[PDB]
Design a protein around this nucleic acid. Structure first.
Ligand SMILES: [Mn+2]
Ligand SMILES: [Mn+2]
Ligand SMILES: [Mn+2]
Ligand SMILES: [Mn+2]
Ligand SMILES: [Mn+2]
Ligand SMILES: [Mn+2]
Ligand SMILES: [Mn+2]
Ligand SMILES: [Mn+2]
Ligand SMILES: [Mn+2]
Ligand SMILES: [Mn+2]
Ligand SMILES: [Mn+2]
Ligand SMILES: [Mn+2]
Ligand SMILES: [Mn+2]
Ligand SMILES: [Mn+2]
Ligand SMILES: [Mn+2]
Ligand SMILES: [Mn+2]
Ligand SMILES: [Mn+2]
Lengths: 80, 97, 98, 107, 106, 97, 97, 87
DNA sequence: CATATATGCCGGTCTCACACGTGCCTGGAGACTAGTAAGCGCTTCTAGTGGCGGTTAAAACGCGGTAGACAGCGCGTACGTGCGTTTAAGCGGTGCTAGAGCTGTCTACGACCAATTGAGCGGCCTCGGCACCGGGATATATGGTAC
DNA sequence: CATATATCCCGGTGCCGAGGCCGCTCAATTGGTCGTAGACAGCTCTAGCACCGCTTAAACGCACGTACGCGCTGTCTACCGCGTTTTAACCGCCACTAGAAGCGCTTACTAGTCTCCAGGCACGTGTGAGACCGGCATATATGGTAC
């Protein structure tokens, strides 16, 4: 029912295939859901910390870019 | 003669040591490690504060930039306690002017 | 009827998705997840549309990388099938996990 | 007149003046507020006390008066939050935590 | 009267802007006259190198306009750019086609 | 509608694209990537140059600090080229005083 | 006379070296290797002894770390013996390549 | 006006035992015979990479003596921060 | 072999983002002044280098044998396919207004200054903590043997 | 059960590094000055959000059955433990001087200021690159069956 289930068994397949995975155990999908959640948690936490510091109520691309930089996941193409 | 004046946090590390463990000493190498530690966390906090100021077109690092830096850099309970200890020292300093 | 042997479509899909650059998660489910996770840190938040897109680019890129390293850990164990324990070892060696 | 040290006024052992100088002489911003070095010196003092507490406990478990680098390593690696803070740091002469994988134990 | 230090150094990349960004970025008290020319030249060099390879990737793909994928192809096929950009995600970049041998059919 | 002014390197990325590949162009997204790239390498070299100056108790980032930065930052061949393009452009720029 | 079964002394050795902090590579060999490698980068270099102890502390801590990751790669393969392919996989996932 | 003895094969001074001891502290119980040469390879690449950066800091300082601090800044550059040797 | 279907391609068709010309406006670039960072002389003397021989702990080698690596088998089911069905994502939409974020006024605050003074440093001396040692207490792993 | 061999934990011994006294002295404190960063409030209008209802495409679930994970087994040899022999680390001392580190002179370099002048911007266009795509052509997977 939760939003994390919005990340479907098929969407996770597609991502595994782009990373060259041929065969996928059924336990993977929940495992990916948990990893993805920790990833978004860590990144959004820092992004929002930057939003609060600018005294804003809108998360900007630049808040996400600075947050990705901090976490060693530098993203080109959004105002780096 | 009379070697150059090399600064160090050792004096302060000994003071905090005696508060917490009055009968406990520390070896040269252990003090080397505590020195590195304080220099390292200084740079990390200073660094994030610098970035925060620059991202918001501010010329000034204030206790507000330190406090956001501390929250981005320290894990959970360590950040809560650091923030509370830092906010305390500012409040106490602000009223001792 | 007609049936491709098991593994043959899987390979097509690999070739297909490694050839393209489109996002592989549906935008709105992802977006609702972002807003949800963020509520738990600061309430009454708006997001730039580009901020959701940056987050989705970064997550898909991260998961595709991780799947590569997982695939290697599976294969290291003489398998073709990625298991949770492959993801776990990848994450442990990357320094994400303790 | 006075001269009592900003450390006194903030109620800190860590040197506020030095911290303010290092911020200014460190090229971090044009300007440094009066509260910044107070707040910073207080965080560095908190983290020092926190690790010196655990490390002194390690020294005492180890029947020693003096903190050695091994005691700082035991302290840091056995604390979840410190271990993460110093995740990509090497303590000279620290060694590692005693850890044998289960499958290598004899049956 | 009055010409760019970019043209005095034979650079397309802006030596004046780079000098300002150096002074404004709290890197140091002061900035040498050579520094921004050298830096602007290094940024121009690395921009030419990427655009050269990415340009090629655009032809090999029968396209007249460089898109992000061309840049990803160009960076991940070059050993040294791949290393310089080892911890960078190029949005809308995708990955290199690469299946592990043991996965291919018998 | 009162404009609102935001700089990028896009003009300079076109000038260089036209040198290396005169008959090809670039999508705005691809220009975003090239813009991210330039800002990134800028920060990396400046940062390193900044640390080089501090470690050597020096107030000034000269082309020498930029050069050593480029030697630490860029892999072998990219570094030799960059060092060439860098030294050349400084030579050519002083000679046109 | 008396004979420990294969793996009993290995276990003992793991307990011994995990308790101690002493450098495990002999000092002179390690220095000769540092001198050799650096000389190939540049002739007529001297070293502060503490620059050699720093390099040896950093190298041994890197190798202990790698050996833990290498071990995990063996165990993942239902083996108890570390092999070159365990180091290679560890080094690839670490992004050392 | 004298000589330096010429340095040759010094990687072999990272002997089998020393590597085994490092693997012991890393919790390794059993070791393939091929591990010792592989380890030498990996160590050499590590020393090369760190000494390269150290010496570059030294040359930058116009010094002929590599210092602890040059080593420490190099380790910091490589994500291998070291406490106990200054900075 | 033949048959099925996935994927690639062509040539045409359209559309909207690119890349072009046009202001305009600010953010720079030619003087110009004035003070300091640093380059470059000279001296001091630290600590890095190289050399020797007594001792012995570590390394090396070969041996023997066990336990782990590896391959081959065979069983069971977790998957991958493909299908028919359901669900909601995307989309183009028409509002609707939070709030990003710009401008314009005014303190509060932080830099700068440059005499004044005690915090912190380099020496210097010195015991008490601890490294190292050997004796006697266990603790375990392996081997001898009685049932 | 019995016995052999590692490791613990004990004082006892002796060394030397931590830690505390001093006196010197810079960097930090005072307290007065002045320029502006940024706080605050008004205003604008960009772009974030939201209710709607089609129209597909994508998710779902189901049922079939195959290729793969997995546990067993058996073979063999590589790697551990250990005894003996070899080697070169370590130690403690020389002796020698390169170069690190520090000081004082001295001046090009750079920042700080005005003025000007054009480079880089937001705008507005209109048009060709490329996205789509229908249907056609090619490439490849899969099985039939008769050698
Ligand atoms: Mn709201
Ligand atoms: Mn050589
Ligand atoms: Mn045919
Ligand atoms: Mn066509
Ligand atoms: Mn000077
Ligand atoms: Mn022999
Ligand atoms: Mn076999
Ligand atoms: Mn079974
Ligand atoms: Mn409003
Ligand atoms: Mn002292
Ligand atoms: Mn005493
Ligand atoms: Mn003993
Ligand atoms: Mn005792
Ligand atoms: Mn303002
Ligand atoms: Mn000399
Ligand atoms: Mn079609
Ligand atoms: Mn067939």
């Amino acid at each position: 029912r939760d939003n994390i289930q919005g990340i479907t068994k098929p969407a996770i397949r597609r991502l595994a295939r782009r990373g060259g995975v041929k065969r996928i155990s059924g336990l993977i999908y929940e495992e990916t859901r948990g990893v993805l959640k920790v990833f978004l948690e860590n990144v959004i936490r820092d992004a929002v910390t930057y939003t609060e510091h600018a005294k804003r109520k809108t998360v900007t691309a630049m808040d996400v870019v600075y947050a990705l930089k901090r976490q060693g996941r530098t993203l080109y193409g959004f105002g780096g | 003669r009379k070697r150059s004046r090399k600064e160090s946090y050792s004096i302060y590390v000994y003071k905090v040591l005696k508060q917490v463990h009055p009968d406990t000493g520390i070896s040269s190498k252990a003090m080397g490690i505590m020195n590195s530690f304080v220099n390292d966390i200084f740079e990390r906090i200073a660094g994030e504060a610098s970035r925060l100021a620059h991202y918001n077109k501010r010329s000034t690092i204030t206790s507000r930039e330190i406090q956001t830096a501390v929250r981005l850099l320290l894990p959970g309970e360590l950040a809560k306690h650091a923030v509370s200890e830092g906010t305390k020292a500012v409040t106490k300093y602000t009223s001792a002017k | 009827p007609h049936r491709y042997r098991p593994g043959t479509v899987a390979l097509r899909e690999i070739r297909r998705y490694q050839k393209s650059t489109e996002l592989l998660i549906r935008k709105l489910p992802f977006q609702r997840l972002v807003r949800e996770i963020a509520q738990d840190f600061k309430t009454d938040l708006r997001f730039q549309s580009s901020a959701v897109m940056a987050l989705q680019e970064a997550c898909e890129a991260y998961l595709v990388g991780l799947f590569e390293d997982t695939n290697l850990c599976a294969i290291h164990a003489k398998r073709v099938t990625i298991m949770p324990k492959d993801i776990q070892l990848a994450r442990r060696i990357r320094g994400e996990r303790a | 007149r006075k001269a009592k040290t900003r450390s006194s006024r903030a109620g800190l052992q860590f040197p506020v003046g030095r911290v303010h100088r290092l911020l200014r002489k460190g090229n971090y911003s044009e300007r440094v507020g009066a509260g910044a070095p107070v707040y910073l010196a207080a965080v560095l003092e908190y983290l020092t006390a926190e690790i010196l507490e655990l490390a002194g406990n390690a020294a005492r478990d180890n029947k020693k008066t003096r903190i050695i680098p091994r005691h700082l390593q035991l302290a840091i690696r056995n604390d979840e939050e410190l271990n993460k803070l110093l995740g990509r740091v090497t303590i000279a002469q620290g060694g590692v935590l005693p850890n044998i994988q289960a499958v290598l134990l004899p049956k």
